[PDB]
């Protein structure tokens, strides 16, 4: 009766940050003790409660958000942060009670000659609300003249390719991100072994 934590963490293909993947976790037993005790992670920041405490708390629903960004953009996956990823792609609330996990992904997502399969939203009329997901491909109308779905002057496709090549530095290398959020809204059916 274990929770599908491996299906999220050890998956082959990760989603792009503009269309981040979310999985609802309920009616099972998880062990943040095992998941955090692995030297595989670059950043393991949990805001609010701590992993040791999480084994004694229970929640009606747990959410695992997974995507891929650059190394220097992991800072943006945090409460009260700004930037392209935080504003247009993935936004965390200021009162965030959850966990941000990231590890390097160069051996898995970098293709020599450039892996331009991973995209990010480059333009948006407004900043994203927390946990909002925008997957629209609508031409961004920077100017007063309409675009009518065709790219051109002041009319730009809102998504941009990541330039992932294994020769570049660490900050420009891909990173896999998993954001754990705990929801209390219902009975609590996601619990630690304790």
């Amino acid at each position: 009766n274990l929770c599908p934590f491996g299906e999220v963490f050890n998956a082959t293909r990760f989603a792009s940050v503009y269309a981040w993947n979310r999985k609802r976790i309920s009616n099972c037993v998880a062990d943040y003790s095992v998941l955090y005790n692995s030297a595989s992670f670059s950043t393991f920041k949990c805001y609010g409660v701590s992993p040791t405490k999480l084994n004694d708390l229970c929640f009606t629903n747990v959410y695992a958000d997974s995507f891929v960004i650059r190394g220097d953009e992991v800072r943006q996956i945090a409460p009260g942060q700004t930037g392209k990823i935080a504003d247009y792609n993935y936004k965390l609330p200021d009162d965030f009670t959850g966990c941000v996990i990231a590890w390097n992904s160069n051996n898995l997502d970098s293709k020599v000659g450039g892996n331009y399969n991973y995209l990010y939203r480059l333009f948006r009329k407004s900043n994203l609300k927390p946990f909002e997901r925008d997957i629209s491909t609508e031409i961004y109308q920077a100017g007063s003249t309409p675009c009518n779905g065709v790219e051109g002057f002041n009319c730009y496709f809102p998504l941009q390719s990541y330039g992932f090549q294994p020769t570049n530095g660490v900050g420009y290398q891909p990173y896999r991100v998993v954001v754990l959020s705990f929801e209390l809204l219902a009975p609590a059916t996601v619990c630690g072994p304790k």
């Epitope: 333009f123 920077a142 100017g143 002057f153 730009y156 390719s161 900050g171």
Partner: antibody, heavy 117, light 110 residues
Framework: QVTLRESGPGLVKPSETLSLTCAVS???????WSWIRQHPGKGLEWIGY???????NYNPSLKSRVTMSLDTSKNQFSLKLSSVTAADTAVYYC????????????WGQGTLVTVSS | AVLTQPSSASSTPGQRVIISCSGS????????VSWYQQVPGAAPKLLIY???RRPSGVPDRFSGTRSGTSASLGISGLQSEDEADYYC???????????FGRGTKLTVLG
């Protein structure tokens, strides 16, 4: 789309103020209006831009000597470069990247400014 | 000023050439690279914007990539009309300025 045409004196004495005007073909649009120059047989040197909001950003090399303005009346934006020397001899281009400060899509024909006594 | 470009490039008609542009985290690393063509006597012309997008009226032969701190421009099926100076450009956050490469003079030798 919009059309840019520079108009310039051509000859400016050293230590004086070089002035140019780029005529826009309305000018109350949300564009960045930039100025580019190119020394004879050399590369492109960005001078600066002026936003329709009036916001201003100049090249660090030339910031003290550069002033750019907007004029809704004549539908033109201007460039002024003070304490001009013989290093300011160049072809000056007015360009615009549009509403997003990135690549310059529309250019002017260019005007040659010679600095000599 | 801070973007590095090879002075010269060379190829033969019908072939392909690649012009590279090297910079910093402050410009190419975090900002978009655009490419311009200048035939002598004429104003510069935008070939590539947003790393790989081509504006209206530019053939498929022109292509661009950005990876880390370096950018590349590819010209397929070179013809004699393609002899020109090629400039890369990007915005520099540290300098708060728009930065150009020195330019790459391309010659079709055959």
């Amino acid at each position: 789309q919009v059309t840019l045409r520079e108009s310039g004196p051509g000859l400016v004495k050293p230590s004086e103020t070089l002035s140019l005007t780029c005529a826009v073909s309305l000018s109350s649009v949300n564009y960045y209006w930039s100025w580019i120059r190119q020394h004879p047989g050399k590369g492109l040197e960005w001078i600066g831009y002026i936003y329709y909001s009036g916001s201003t950003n100049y090249n660090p090399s030339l910031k003290s000597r550069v002033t750019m303005s907007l004029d809704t009346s004549k539908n033109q934006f201007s460039l002024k470069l003070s304490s001009v020397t013989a290093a300011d001899t160049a072809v000056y281009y007015c360009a615009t990247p549009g509403a997003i400060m990135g690549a310059l899509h529309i250019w002017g024909q260019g005007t040659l400014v010679t600095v000599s006594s | 000023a801070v973007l590095t470009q090879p002075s010269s490039a060379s190829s033969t008609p019908g072939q392909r050439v690649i012009i590279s542009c090297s910079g910093s985290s402050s410009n190419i690393g975090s900002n978009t690279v655009s490419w311009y063509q200048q035939v002598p006597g004429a104003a510069p012309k935008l070939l590539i914007y947003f790393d790989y997008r081509r504006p209206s009226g530019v053939p498929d032969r022109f292509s661009g990539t950005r990876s880390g701190t370096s950018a590349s421009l590819g010209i397929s099926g070179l013809q004699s009309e393609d002899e020109a100076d090629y400039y890369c450009a990007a915005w520099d956050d540290s300098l708060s300025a728009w930065v150009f490469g020195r330019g790459t003079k391309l010659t079709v030798l055959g």
